[PDB]
Amino acid sequence: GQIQISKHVKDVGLPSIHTPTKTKLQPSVFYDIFPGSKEPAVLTEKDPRLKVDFDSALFSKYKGNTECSLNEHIQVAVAHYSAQLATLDIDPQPIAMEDSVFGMDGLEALDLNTSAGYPYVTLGIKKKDLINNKTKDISKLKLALDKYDVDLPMITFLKDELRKKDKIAAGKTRVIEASSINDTILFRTVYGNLFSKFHLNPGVVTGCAVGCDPETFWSKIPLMLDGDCIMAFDYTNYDGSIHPIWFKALGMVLDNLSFNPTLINRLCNSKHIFKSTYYEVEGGVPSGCSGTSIFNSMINNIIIRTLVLDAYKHIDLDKLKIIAYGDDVIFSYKYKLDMEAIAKEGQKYGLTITPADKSSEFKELDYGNVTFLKRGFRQDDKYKFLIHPTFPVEEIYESIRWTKKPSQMQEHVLSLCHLMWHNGPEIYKDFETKIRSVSAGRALYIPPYELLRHEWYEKF
RNA sequence: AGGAGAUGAAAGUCUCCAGGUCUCUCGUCCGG
RNA sequence: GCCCGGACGAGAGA
């Protein structure tokens, strides 16, 4: 995250971009029944709740880059992770346009419901206008691709979500980086085969959790991290604190898999437009690009290997087991390591690592206090080899208070019941009861705790 | 400001639209 | 009924 250049769009022959300002979120019929502090993020400087300058708060996350270079440990990390991935036997060959657009085994189709990016967003062109899902006609898309070529600027948008109260006045809204459909397709065509293999193989070989079902995967994890010390921690602004050298690393891994290692320099050194400002950034993974999840994850796997090599002199990398989902990571070693000491080593690279789940200091962890993807671990009372993914009840209460689709609070409630019941019968009982304390809740179908339970057992 | 539409003979007026890459899960529907 | 395939929505997570 180093801003290199910053210009007015007109002085580069670029349009301004309409940036949305209204939230889709609104209070649900349960707004008053459950406790919660969260509210929609700030989307404009004219938000009354805002107690600071919005732009200065938005772009404050771009600091600079620490002075570091590659080194032998990073090169060892690359060598080791590269060796792992090769065992998967990934085809480095490109994929056909048809697969880039409509998907293939382990690659979803393009999202026809989201923006097409620059320049279509300034010309009233939607993805659906370029792609006819029902006839698979892509004549219009082919025409656009030729017309505007590639490496178009990503467009900065504000993410419309609930945030904690303390992110509202502070104006700490998360930003999104919109990839042009031209570029998404391009990255898919080159890297599709890699993305797919990752999607189809969550676990300790990909070093990646993307593509897992927590309800069934949670029982595999203690088998995959067979180790003695199990550990986890937190990144302060992971994506923007990625130094260009991790990108050189990622490239080296890609190269060892016989993929193209240069396209990703469009992520390291990226073009963006925010409203009427054109800018370019050196460093940081532009969350919103093609492959954010995979590339962020692959990178984490290098970092963690490097950090451990830095902190400990005689390590067995084969017994350092890692699973990552972007910035989120859980890992193990065969003996006990000092999380505190490892986190320290990230500092010289520009990484800020903190005790997992907002502790004040680093404490030991086991499958009792550790979490991944917001979920905890706890064994079934009947089958001790089956592990529940626990979910924070506070977040369930915050979630139910808001809705983006009033006419389907039923679907909403069902999604939460499937999260909640893993926490146990009596909390689930209480949840049901609170729901039915009002008329709207009693109108709703709610799955019985035992129905949920047995359905869970049948998946094993 | 751009796009789409409504209105008007026109001049004009009016209304709507815009928000990433993904994973899993649930609901509904059509299928083999 | 199970398995998979599509479509339309939603919720959570990164």
Author numbering: 1 to 460
Publication excerpt:
The replication of positive-strand RNA viruses relies on virally encoded RNA-dependent RNA polymerases (RdRPs) that are capable of rapid and processive synthesis of the 7–14 kilobase viral genomes. To examine this in further detail and to validate the polymerase–RNA interactions seen in the initial poliovirus EC structures, we here present nine new coxsackievirus, rhinovirus, and poliovirus elongation complex structures at resolutions ranging from 2.1 to 2.9 Å. All the complexes feature an upstream RNA duplex that is pinched between the pinky finger and thumb domains such that the RNA exit channel is opened by ≈4 Å as compared to the polymerase alone structures. All of the complexes show the open conformation for the active site wherein the β-strands of motifs A and C are not hydrogen bonded together to fully form the RMM-fold that is commonly utilized by polymerase active sites.
